[PDB]
Write an enzyme that holds these catalytic residues in place. Sequence first.
Site, PDB file in Angstrom:
ATOM      1  CB  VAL A 191      39.156  47.645  39.838  1.00 12.22           C
ATOM      2  CG1 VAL A 191      39.338  49.171  39.816  1.00 12.22           C
ATOM      3  CG2 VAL A 191      40.446  46.967  39.369  1.00 12.22           C
ATOM      4  N   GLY A 241      39.394  57.116  35.762  1.00 10.71           N
ATOM      5  CA  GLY A 241      39.728  57.416  34.373  1.00 10.71           C
ATOM      6  C   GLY A 241      38.647  57.201  33.340  1.00 10.71           C
ATOM      7  CG  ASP A 269      49.263  43.284  29.418  1.00  8.76           C
ATOM      8  OD1 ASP A 269      48.915  42.751  28.347  1.00  8.76           O
ATOM      9  OD2 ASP A 269      48.694  43.051  30.487  1.00  8.76           O
ATOM     10  CB  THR A 307      50.763  44.013  36.409  1.00  6.81           C
ATOM     11  OG1 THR A 307      51.253  42.907  37.160  1.00  6.81           O
ATOM     12  CG2 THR A 307      50.116  43.565  35.132  1.00  6.81           C
TER      13      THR A 307
END
Length: 329
Positions: free
Chosen positions: A29, A139, A180, A220
Amino acid sequence: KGPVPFSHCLPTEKLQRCEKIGEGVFGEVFQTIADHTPVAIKIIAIEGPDLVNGSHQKTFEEILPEIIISKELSLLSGEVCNRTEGFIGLNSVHCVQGSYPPLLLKAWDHYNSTKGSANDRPDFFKDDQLFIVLEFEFGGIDLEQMRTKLSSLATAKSILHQLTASLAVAEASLRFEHRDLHWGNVLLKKTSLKKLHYTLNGKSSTIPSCGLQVSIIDYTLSRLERDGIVVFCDVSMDEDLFTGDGDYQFDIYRLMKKENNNRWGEYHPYSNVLWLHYLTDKMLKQMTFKTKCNTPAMKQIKRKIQEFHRTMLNFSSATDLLCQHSLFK
Ligand SMILES: CN1CCNC(=O)c2cccc(c2)-c2cnn3ccc(nc23)NCC1
Ligand code: NA
């Protein structure tokens, strides 16, 4: 109608401003800037035969659920009956073909030198290698990294309220389970807004922000459905996911499997309650605040979060928690 070069979603100036911000077995990322606005770029190798960070690459069919879910949750910001901005905005998704850009390897090396990396340096891909590149709203910084940075338990209350409202809206609209939601997947960013707005089955309300806006990320393992078509990750035969230790996190995987009888296609919104319990537990046991509850209105907030911790597992969904729990009245 086919894959694009990296340069299509990372033109030179955008690539030159990439800085690595995080990683996992999945990939990398980066943060960058375009039109004066930060964005996050998630890059996942697909379809190839090399191990990457010790694991096999996903196929296109295996990565599709994360793509689909990312879009559906982003779209909740612009809906009417079930509306929330508590997920992360999705700007674009591309399938790219090429070796890893040298400028991204430069960013990768800087992170390795300063923070250290558990990943392989991604310099072994050939010019036919496929990737998915997801561009998201930036974010902020994750809850884990903000362990010692928050003001008080009043901020913790706002964070739990925001998370519960987001999950409830997604339950109502999409029969969503995150599955998750560890504290690395809760992002925090400053807001000048005093209150944040959501709509649940046509009823709108507000949440005091305490100066932070929460974004839920990483789909995911997530599940949702529309018109009976279910999109999810089938972990029924995964061994490793259920054999973790050393954190309550790893018990949540086992507790989910108990709740759903190892049938991951089904809808069990109790998994959202389990994650919120785990997050409440982090707020009370591992987070540490700059100002403790040294006053009466604050000592009441503390007691109420303690009461949430010990009662919330008796609720059936985030929707039940939001609509019925005393913490949110
Ligand atoms: C390694 N990352 C965990 C896995 N990432 C995701 O699944 C993901 C998905 C959508 C958006 C983002 C991340 C995202 C957006 N802003 N931002 C700010 C910090 C940040 N990630 C992000 N740190 C890295 C955390
Ligand atoms: Na958002």
